[PDB]
DNA sequence: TTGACTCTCTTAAGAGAGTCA
DNA sequence: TTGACTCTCTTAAGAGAGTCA
């Protein structure tokens, strides 16, 4: 198995890599009508991506170094994390991004936690509009607001009480 | 089916059953912490379900009507909204629900949203902590909360900033 | 050892359709 | 006509693994 020396020289090697990457401003809401900066490490939109990455998919990267011989693989996001636990709650940790933006791979744009709670930040109102997460979201969900609901409850008859 | 008349038929017959289904009490919080009651209508955990009702699923079941001969189906949440648009912006509208009870058919407890909407509404504070849905929420989220993140953002070099 | 592709899978909110009796 | 089963699919946040040179 790898050893923790090794685990540190992937993600250093990762962080040099992702490090080199466009980075680029965006102006983002933090809630309470407040806005602020996120500076993103995109990863390229076609090959070559850097070197270690390549592309699984849409928006899915994979992370590879060959270790003695033997090729190790890693999802793009994990690598921040591998010395981390990988579940808890008996869920597993997953890769979630405060800046909601899956090109990125800036590491202090990264959390790890359970899919669920990765989910529910597209909706926070933000770290100051009454986010509650412990690790604090850096901007707003960008699914927060009122919603666009087509049709409410409703009844025809009698036959229902809330 | 294709008249207004018989869709209108359709929901008639489905309110009824539905309306035949046991009245479960649900004690709910709704933010702020305040509790309320909701009053949930349950299709049954096995067969017989009510006329025209089948599970498809675990937590899945299909409402069936044979008009002009002909056999028409839905899934059995979408009943009441057969009136209404079956997409907004591009995206499909969903049966979703605000008691966050799936064998529940309470129409009461249903609306007709993006399935965006529908999940987000699993985090909402609630309408008595914050909740901002233009079709207000019916209790407080169940995934609401601080989460359980393993690990935050961080880097073991100087290469990125926020 | 490395790059650039290929494929399928997980989760939890939701769906459609066929086989029998 | 109605009931009780069977199967796979959608979405958008996430994954693992194979092939070839
Ligand atoms: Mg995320
Ligand atoms: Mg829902
Ligand atoms: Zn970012
Ligand atoms: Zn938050
Ligand atoms: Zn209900
Ligand atoms: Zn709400």
Redesign the interface.
């Not at 597209?122 to 109102?125: A, G, Q, R, S, V």
């Not at 036959?159 to 809330?162: N, R, S, T």
């Given at each position: 198995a790898l050893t923790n020396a090794q685990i540190?020289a992937v993600?250093?090697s990762w962080?040099?890599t992702?490090?080199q990457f466009p980075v680029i401003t965006h102006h983002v809401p933090l809630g309470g009508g407040l806005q602020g900066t996120?500076?993103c490490?995109e990863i390229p939109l076609a090959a070559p991506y850097g070197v270690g990455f390549a592309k699984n998919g849409p928006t899915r990267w994979q992370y590879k170094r060959t270790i003695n011989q033997v090729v190790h693989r890693w999802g793009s996001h994990t690598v921040?994390?591998l010395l981390?636990?990988d579940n808890?709650?008996g869920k597993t940790?997953t890769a979630?991004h405060?800046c909601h933006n899956t090109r990125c791979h800036?590491?202090?744009?990264?959390?790890?936690?359970?899919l669920?709670?990765n989910?529910?930040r597209?909706?926070?109102?933000g770290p100051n509009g009454?986010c509650?997460?412990?690790?604090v979201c850096?901007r707003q969900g960008p699914?927060?607001?009122?919603?666009?609901?087509?049709?409410?409850?409703?009844?025809?008859?009698s036959?229902?009480?809330?």
């Open positions: 540190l993600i250093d962080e040099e992702v490090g996120l500076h490490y921040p994390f981390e636990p808890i709650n940790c979630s405060l800036n590491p202090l744009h990264l959390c790890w936690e359970s669920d709670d989910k529910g597209n909706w926070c109102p009454g509650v997460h412990a690790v850096l699914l927060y607001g009122p919603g666009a609901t087509v049709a409410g409850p409703q009844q025809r008859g036959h229902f009480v809330v």
